[PDB]
Design a protein around this nucleic acid. Sequence first.
RNA 1: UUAGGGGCUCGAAGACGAUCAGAUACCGUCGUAGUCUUAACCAUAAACUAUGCCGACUAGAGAUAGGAAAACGUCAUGACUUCUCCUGCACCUUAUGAGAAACCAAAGUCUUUGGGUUCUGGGGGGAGUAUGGUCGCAAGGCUGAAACUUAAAGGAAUU
Lengths: 99, 129, 117, 225, 80, 87, 198
Amino acid sequence: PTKRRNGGRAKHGRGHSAVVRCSNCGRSCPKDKAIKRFNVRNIVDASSQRDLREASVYNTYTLPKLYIKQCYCVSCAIHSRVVRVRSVEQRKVRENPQR
Amino acid sequence: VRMNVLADCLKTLVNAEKRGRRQVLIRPSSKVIIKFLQCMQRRGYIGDFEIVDDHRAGKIVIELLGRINKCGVISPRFDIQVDKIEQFCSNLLPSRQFGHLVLTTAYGIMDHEEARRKHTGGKILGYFF
Amino acid sequence: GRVRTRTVKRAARQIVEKYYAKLTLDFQINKKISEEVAVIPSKRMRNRVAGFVTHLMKRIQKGPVRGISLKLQEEERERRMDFVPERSEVDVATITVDQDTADMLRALDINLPNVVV
Amino acid sequence: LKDWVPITKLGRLVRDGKISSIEEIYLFSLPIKEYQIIDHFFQPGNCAAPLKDDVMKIMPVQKQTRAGQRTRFKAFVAVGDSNGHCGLGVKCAKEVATAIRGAIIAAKLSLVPVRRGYWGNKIGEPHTVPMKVSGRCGSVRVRLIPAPRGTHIVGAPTTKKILGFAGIKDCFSNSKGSTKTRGNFMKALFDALSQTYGYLTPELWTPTVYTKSPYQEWSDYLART
Amino acid sequence: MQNDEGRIVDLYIPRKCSATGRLIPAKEHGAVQINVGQVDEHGRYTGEYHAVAISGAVRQRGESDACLNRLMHEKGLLSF
Amino acid sequence: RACYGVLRHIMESGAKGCEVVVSGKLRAQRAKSMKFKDGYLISTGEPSKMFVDQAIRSVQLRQGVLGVRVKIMLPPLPDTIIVMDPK
Amino acid sequence: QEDSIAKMLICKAHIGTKNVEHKMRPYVFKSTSEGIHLINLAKTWEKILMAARVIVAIENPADVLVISARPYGSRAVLKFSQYVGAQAIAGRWTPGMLTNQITQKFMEPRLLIVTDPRTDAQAVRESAYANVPVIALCDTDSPLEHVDICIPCNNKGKESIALMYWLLAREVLYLRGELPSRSVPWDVMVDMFLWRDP
RNA sequence: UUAGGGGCUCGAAGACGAUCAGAUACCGUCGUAGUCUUAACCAUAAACUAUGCCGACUAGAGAUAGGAAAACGUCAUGACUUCUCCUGCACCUUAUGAGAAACCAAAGUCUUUGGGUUCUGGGGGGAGUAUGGUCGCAAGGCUGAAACUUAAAGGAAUU
């Protein structure tokens, strides 16, 4: 039986999508079915960054953020607990948890 | 594309019958449909209908009642031989008492009740009950 | 933990509904009071219900409590229900309509005193 | 046995003897919630005739849980008085006799009138399903067809019983699908007979009278407890 | 449903839904029968009424009210 | 048929609740204990021993021995609290 | 006559939601800028004249229910239960009122009235098990499924609910013959139908 | 695969180094064919929406891509707002429509069985095998049996 109406790849009127390699696994999955979290984050945590505010040259300084787009394999995600797993009813929701 | 004109209109009718509409329009209309609708109208299965004279095939708009359970069409148009009108409606219609086969004949389009007493068979066209 | 079962709840809850008068916030009069009004077989049970009676009386002192029939509030809830001012409408002749809302009645008819803000 | 305390508007009316017979209830389409209402109409001797109950089948059902298996018995019971009244009911329980009690109660509660016709000429009391009537339940299509008088009933033995309890003397049965599942087959046959009144003929083209309900006319009794 | 000469055989006649004109069976528990009371001049008054019935097939669509407007426009007492 | 008749008498007599078990072989070579119960019946505590009354016998058949339990709840409980109305 | 239509401006009863249902669309007209839809206040009041004539022509008024889940209905509905002598429920409904004979709040009404069919859909579902015709105060959001006789208003405003249940009781009373003449408006004010903060 | 170019990285084979009872594997380090391109072949993929192709009618709401019309519309031929029209990929909600169920605006309008037409299937193996044919440079493709064998294979949900 179909576990998803979608199939999990979210592809319509193509026949062929682009491909990406998983950032951890190595695996070629399709770009559409990859599962992607764009992790913006500053370099030195939060607690440790006050050392740089103390130590530095210049009156104030914006500690510049690190921008990366992670892409995952399904199996790499479910192992690493990005997505885990959901019920048959609650599967269908597509919104943002943590807006 | 669009082979039988009558076949489309009776499906259009019987759908919007079951949904329960007061009146329906059908398209593209013909000489056969008005004669087919005329012999429904005698037996009291639908009310009045207009037929707008657009410069084209035309549109037929029928007032209808909650009375037809179904009407249909027999493509291919088989031949039948007055013996075999009784054999068809035993198979086809829901009972012996009510319902009508309707079949084109060289004395005009008519029901099987009229086709018995005029004593001439022809090609079967459709049915209703 | 010291969580009380529905047999302990029902008995202590039913006392404050009807015998609300008498017992004070104080415990050691309520321990005595609970025994006389109602049958309680054992000594351990009579404290545990009577402690919860004084817990309810503290919550009745603090605010209005859900699930209690008492009817005192109803007697006093009905006095809130009874009261009425002059009027909240027909006040005063002209009513603050808009561009769109005024043009309902211009299409619809019915003549009235109106505003267009 | 026994003087039941009627509950609901319908229960009060029937015991008093205000509503005359069940065709008045079926007209205004009111749910009969106690079986004691329908027990009243079909009185012994007086009923002409008393309702008859037969146990169609007993099926053991098992649920596999933890250690060991628990088995309950599901009892299919049809019930009818010949002359257009039939019913169909199911219940499951841990013992067998306790299932059949409740199955008969459920059968009486789901009691449905069946209109019946003549096949061509129409003399001397109707004897047939009045048209070609289909019923389905869960991959079991069943089709009842009018037959001439004296034809008897043509069908499965199960078919003969629950058309028998309706009072239909003559038939031609067809049966597509898995007729082995008797639970579905009885429901398929039953929901065929339920649709007989629902089907519109040219006999019923005349617009309706609209009488007052039994809920309307005996309102002033139902004011007082 | 007659036979031979007179005698309307069968027990009772199912009500016909006003909106669709289709018969209401025994076990349709979603069926309705409304009574709407009339008035005299400077009424007041009830007890004389227009009865009207509609089936649970029509109601579960949501098309009960649109048809029930039509059935008491033709009576007089609405102006849609 | 027998066990319902015994269960009917004690229920009619004005016991609060009861049960009647019948262990041992019955329409079978493997043993299969039938159980009958109507009205509530506590199992536990010191209030068990007073408010129940409980009994056991043997009875001997062609194919073997049957068991037969009876247990009958009677009419100042621990659990229940009857509160007065003040007027 | 004119004055009920004038009072509906003070209600803010003509105001409804952004979203509009297909069935509820006939009543709404001239949707405004900002995306808010306006109701024909003739077509509101004509259906209270309809809905009064349904509630009258019941012999026992106790066989009518009035239901509201939302707390703005609670003071409104309990005043409606006085003047038309009807049963009333506020707050949590408990399903198996109309089915389930054994439950001790088993009510078998003839007619049923609701504030919103969205908020207490469980009442409107249960009406289809017991042949109970509904009456509803619809918004442009709310469904018409198992709903006879919409009265299209603002449901969400606390002023606006009261001033329907004022007009029904008054409308029902004149029909009932409770009020001898239409020279007087009425004895009782609107503000018995309201909701208060404490 | 065949014949010339090009050959960075990756990398069936192969090579050692680990792990293990063994490990011709997973992991690690090198690494030829291949990967890329011109010129021929091959003709199959879970080549999938596992749903043939035209046509009619069934039910709404909000998005979206392309084009078109309207507005004393807002900011500067165009961007955006509001509204209607066809044509796309879809999505949500719901059905007295369907289904074995999962689910489905098609899998609906089918025992109340006929709009037109192409191809395919008849318990599970044996078998996509044998033999013969035909296409192919090969690898293999298309067509395609029997003897004997067996009471269950298989589908969707429940505990």
